[PDB]
Structure formats: C-alpha cells, structure tokens
C-alpha cells in the first residue's frame, strides 16, 4: 500500500505479487562459503567491472542489476568456483540480462570483445545455458534498482494518479542509485530484501516519512538495513554526489536510466 | 528429455524455430513443441525465447497456455506447452457463415480478459494479441498464447520496442509514435477481437501504418485534444489528417446490445489513460449473466 489506485489493475493485487515474487527469488549473504578459493572483494571487483562495461555500452541500470542478481543466485547453486571462472560467469549473466532488457543489446561478439580475449563467444554461449538452467529459468526478479524506480514514481505522484508514466527528477534518482551501486559491491547486502536496500538508500537521502509513504515499510523494517548502510551513506556524503550525464544516442528523458561507473572500489574500503 | 515424445505433425514456423504437435508414446498425452536449433542461432537462445520462458514460468493461469517443460538436448532447445485444438482465427473462419453464438462470444471475451487481467497484474505486456494467438479447446476454454513478443514492464515504464503488435490489432498510441505505451495496448487488441467475433470481419484491416490510422479515424472519429490530451503533440500526428466524425456503434457492430456496445466503446477509447482495464472490463454489465463481484473490503 504505497501504490495509488491503479488504472490497469488492482493495486493490492499488483503490490502483493511484487512482494511475493520477492519471496521466490532467494538470496544468500554467505554464498561465498561454498567457494573457499573466493573472497568477497573478488565479487565486488567482478560486479564493479560489469558496471563499467554497462556504461561503455550505455546499457540500462536494470540490466546491470539483472546481471548482478543472476550472478549472485547462480553462485549459490554452485560449489567450487575459482577466480579465473568469474569473468565468464559475469559477462554471461550480463549477456542474458542485455538480451532480456535492451531493445538492441550488444552482440555476442561484443560481449566476447570486452573481456579482452579471456572469454570466447562459444564459452559465453555454453555458460548462459548453464546459468539459465541452474536458475530454473527464473530470470524475472524485482532488482534493487526497479524498487528505486517504483519508489521515485510514488514520491512524485500528482493528483492525476498515473504511476506508469515516468514523472520524477532524473538527477536525484542518479544520486540514490550511486549509493545502491556501492552497497551491492558488499556481499552482506544480500541479507536485506532488495526492496529494503532500495528503501534504506532512499531514506538516507530523505526521511522516514517519505520512505514510508513511497515504500510501505515502517521504520523498523528498515532500521537494521539503515544501520548497515550507515558507513556507505557517509562515504558517499563525504565525497558529494555525481551530476546527471548526457549519453550520445540516448534520449535525455532516458539518461538517468543509463548505468554509470565511478571508483566505488576505493569507496568500499571505507 | 526427448526420447518419449514423438513428433506427429509440423504446425508452425517462425524466425527462431519450428513448432510441432507431439505425442507421448504410452501416456497418450499430446503437446506442442517449439524447437530451437542452437547451432543455427548467432546470439544463442534468442532474446524472445528467454523472455517467453521466464515470463511463462511465472504466469500460471487457466487462460494462459501452459509452459510444461524446457529441454536442452545438445544443439537444441525445446519448449513444451499444453496443446490446444485450434486457433480463434480458424474458429472464426469456420463459423463465418453461421456466426459464433453470442453466449460463446461473451464466454470467450470474459476468459480472454481474465487471462489478460492476470498478465497485467503480474506486470506483463502481451503485445501480440491477434486471433491466431488465441487458442481454443473442445470444452469451451480459450487461452492466451505465443508470448514470443511479450515483456515485463516496470513502474514506471520506459521506452520499449516500437515495432510491436500485428498491424490490424495495433493501438493508435503505437501508430502515432508515443514515447510510452502500457497495458492499454493489449485491451485495444481485445476490443478489435471482440468486434471481429461479432462481425466476422476484422475491425480495422489496414495495409500500411497510415491506412491503419485512417481506418481507425473513419470509424471512431479523428481524435483531438479533448478526447485525447496530447494527440496533437505526438511525433506522428499531422494537422492535415481529415476530420472524420465518429460512427454510431449501432452500425459498426449491429448484433451487439447496449452493454456490448458500451464495453466495446470503452475498450477502444483513444486515450490510453481512459481506456478500460482488463479488471474493470470483468465487472462490466455485459458480463452480468456470467459473473458477480467479490465482497469489497473498504
């Protein structure tokens, strides 16, 4: 019940399905225990590099977050992965996500190319099939950033109650996304539901009353997450936020949806 | 895997593979198989198949063709679906001299709207509703099929693929190049289909984008800022379009009563923000001798 009365369906129904899909899409904060040769900063390095390829290719934030999610969930089904297999598993999660999400995704030879020789097309092909079968073809999660999308729409809701037409400030959205991009780099984020992560980040840029009104969470749903997020918010606050970018070939009304990259790895140490 | 099915008949072909009717050897069960030859594919698992699979894995409903299994068996990917009899196109054509009885037309529309209400509540746009993607069985059921062009939608939406929906069933917000489209596009297609069941003639059988728009305009009247706030600012609006008056629905759909006419008229509203939802359509009086509201909790 942050959603308004809907013009296309039952808001109670829509929100409930949204809540309940969040409960079939299982995430595990300790999944790297299954991979003793891996450390959390490998996961962050891998995810950080994907953000940078997304920006180079002007892929959407939704596609980065799909890839992040396919990656984390895939690894939980798997048992002894080595550092050198990471780039394959990551660029292949990205390949699936871009085919799902983009009108004109980069071609497979483009995903081979950006690995600088380390993965071949045939290997990305083998691996996407391994990933999809292991996920049992559940490739439609509500990602961290889609919740932020939802929340921002409600924030900026008119007395003309259409939620489906984008109607929020581009530049503030970017600034909360940049905090979430830092927080995904740390694997312990996985302990909090994606909708909580996105609520807690928005809270840090606003208040409990806004947070509550746009994501129907009471403050105690959010409190634990907010506490964990604290350091990340502070590091961001310390540095100041980024400016909204223009991207060649991308419509300005779509610019805030393009995935960006900054030195989040530096920021993750503090 | 594949041993225990046998192909009985090729029943379809598209860009990404071939469709078969298949039969289980001593189960007697019949299925439809879509076969993708991965060795033939240049981007693997086509984006359309990844979407069709993932979307249908989470869309289980009596009025949505069921995805039963996905089988990877080297160089090939098989999607296994419940098999249905035929196709609303073929049923309409077979019934064209007789007419489909009104009660059956009403049943089919009600079921289509239930299956669509369900997609929309789960945030899925079908985007290719046309009679050949509506499958019927021998027991009076009808179901939404071929989710090869569907997509999950976000809240809010962003700009999606522009080349969507078969021409005859394509909504005016798509034809006029709107930045955004939504669930309203599927309701448009069903409103065209409803009238087509009634008349046994496609409502707006265009042979080009501009002919399609002119067919719509001639029947429903040329839209302006009053009926449709923003039309005149749409990328493919032209001030030169002729100004046709709306045709009275008594003449467009003669067999239909007042309820049918009212429903159809709400399904073909120009303004996507005013066009009726699949859910609200279910509560329409047209469906009184079919359904009842559930108790309203505040």
UniProtKB/Swiss-Prot annotation, chain A:
GO CC terms, sorted: cyclin E1-CDK2 complex; cytoplasm; cytosol; microtubule organizing center; nucleoplasm; nucleus
PTM notes: Ubiquitinated by UHRF2; appears to occur independently of phosphorylation.
Main localization (coarse): nucleus
GO molecular function: cyclin-dependent protein serine/threonine kinase regulator activity; kinase activity; protein kinase binding
Expression across tissues: Highly expressed in testis and placenta. Low levels in bronchial epithelial cells.
Ubl conjugation is among the record's keywords: yes
Keywords in alphabetical order: Cell cycle, Cell division, Cyclin, Nucleus, Phosphoprotein, Ubl conjugation
GO terms, biological process: cell division; DNA replication initiation; G1/S transition of mitotic cell cycle; homologous chromosome pairing at meiosis; negative regulation of transcription by RNA polymerase II; positive regulation of G1/S transition of mitotic cell cycle; positive regulation of mesenchymal stem cell proliferation; protein phosphorylation
Residues carrying Phosphoserine: 1
Cellular localization per UniProt: Nucleus
Protein task: Essential for the control of the cell cycle at the G1/S (start) transition.
UniProt similarity note: Belongs to the cyclin family. Cyclin E subfamily.
Assembly and oligomerization: Interacts with CDK2 protein kinase to form a serine/threonine kinase holoenzyme complex. The cyclin subunit imparts substrate specificity to the complex. Found in a complex with CDK2, CABLES1 and CCNA1. Part of a complex consisting of UHRF2, CDK2 and CCNE1. Interacts directly with UHRF2; the interaction ubiquitinates CCNE1 and appears to occur independently of CCNE1 phosphorylation. Interacts with INCA1.
Protein name: G1/S-specific cyclin-E1
Organism: Homo sapiens
Location of this fragment in the whole protein: 103 to 372 of 410
From Swiss-Prot, chain B:
Binding of Mg(2+), residues: 133, 146
Cofactor dependence: Mg(2+)
Pfam families from the UniProt entry: Pkinase
An individual GO BP term: potassium ion transport
Residues noted as binding ATP in the record, renumbered to the chain: 11-19, 34, 82-84, 87, 130-133, 146
Record InterPro entries: CDK, Kinase-like_dom_sf, Prot_kinase_dom, Protein_kinase_ATP_BS, Ser/Thr_kinase_AS
Keywords annotated in UniProt: Acetylation, ATP-binding, Cell cycle, Cell division, Cytoplasm, Cytoskeleton, DNA damage, DNA repair, Endosome, Kinase, Magnesium, Meiosis, Metal-binding, Mitosis, Nucleotide-binding, Nucleus, Phosphoprotein, S-nitrosylation, Serine/threonine-protein kinase, Transferase
N6-acetyllysine found at: 7
EC nos: 2.7.11.22
GO cellular component, one term: Y chromosome
Protein name: Cyclin-dependent kinase 2
Organism: Homo sapiens
């Amino acid at each position: 019940s942050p959603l308004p009365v809907l013009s296309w369906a039952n808001r109670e129904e829509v929100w409930k399905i949204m809540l309940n899909k969040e409960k079939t899409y299982l995430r595990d904060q300790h999944f790297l225990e299954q991979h003793p040769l891996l450390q959390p900063k490998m996961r962050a390095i891998l995810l950080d590099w994907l953000m940078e390829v997304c920006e180079v290719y002007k892929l959407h934030r939704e596609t980065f977050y799909l890839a992040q999610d396919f990656f984390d969930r895939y690894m939980a089904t798997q048992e002894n992965v080595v550092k050198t297999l990471l780039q394959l598993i990551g660029i292949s999660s990205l390949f699936i996500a871009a085919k799902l999400e983009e009108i004109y995704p980069p071609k497979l030879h483009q995903f081979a190319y950006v690995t600088d020789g380390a993965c071949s097309g045939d290997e990305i092909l083998t691996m996407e099939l391994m990933i999809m079968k292991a996920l049992k073809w559940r490739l439609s999660p509500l990602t961290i950033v889609s919740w932020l999308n939802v929340y921002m729409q409600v924030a900026y809701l008119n007395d003309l109650h259409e939620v489906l037409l984008p109607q929020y400030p581009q530049q503030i959205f970017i600034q909360i996304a940049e905090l979430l991009d830092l927080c995904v780099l740390d694997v312990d984020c996985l302990e909090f539901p994606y909708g909580i992560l996105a609520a807690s980040a928005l809270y840090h840029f606003s208040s409990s009353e806004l947070m509550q009104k746009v994501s129907g969470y009471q403050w105690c749903d959010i409190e634990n997450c907010v506490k964990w997020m604290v350091p990340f918010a502070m590091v961001i606050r310390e540095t100041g936020s980024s400016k909204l970018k223009h991207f060649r070939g991308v419509a300005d009304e779509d610019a805030h949806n393009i995935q960006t990259h900054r030195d989040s790895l530096d920021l993750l140490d503090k | 895997s594949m041993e225990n099915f046998q192909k009985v008949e090729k029943i379809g072909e598209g860009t990404y593979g071939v469709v078969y009717k298949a039969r289980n050897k001593l189960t007697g069960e019949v299925v439809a198989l879509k076969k993708i030859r991965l060795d033939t594919e240049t981007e693997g698992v086509p984006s359309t198949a990844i979407r069709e699979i993932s979307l249908l894995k989470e869309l289980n409903h009596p009025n949505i063709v069921k995805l039963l299994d996905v089988i990877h068996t080297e160089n090939k990917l098989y999607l296994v679906f419940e098999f249905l009899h035929q196709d609303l196109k073929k049923f309409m054509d077979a019934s064209a001299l007789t007419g489909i009885p009104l009660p059956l037309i009403k049943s089919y529309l009600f079921q289509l709207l239930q299956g669509l209400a369900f997609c929309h509540s789960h945030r899925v746009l079908h985007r290719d509703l046309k009679p050949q993607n509506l499958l019927i069985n021998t027991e009076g059921a009808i179901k939404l099929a071929d989710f090869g062009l569907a997509r999950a939608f976000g809240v809010p939406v962003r700009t999606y693929t522009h080349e969507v929906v078969t021409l005859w069933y394509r909504a005016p917000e798509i034809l006029l190049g709107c930045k955004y489209y939504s669930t309203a596009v599927d309701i448009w297609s069903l409103g065209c289909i409803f009238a087509e069941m009634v008349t046994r003639r496609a409502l707006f059988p265009g042979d080009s984008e501009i002919d399609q728009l002119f067919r719509i305009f001639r029947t429903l009247g040329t839209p302006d800022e009053v009926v449709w706030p923003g039309v005149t600012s749409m990328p493919d609006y032209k001030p030169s379009f002729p100004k046709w008056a709306r045709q009275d629905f008594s003449k467009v759909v003669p067999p239909l009563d007042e309820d049918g006419r009212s429903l159809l008229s709400q399904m073909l509203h120009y303004d996507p923000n005013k066009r009726i939802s699949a859910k609200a359509a279910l509560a329409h009086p047209f469906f009184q001798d079919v359904t009842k509201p559930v108790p309203h909790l505040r």
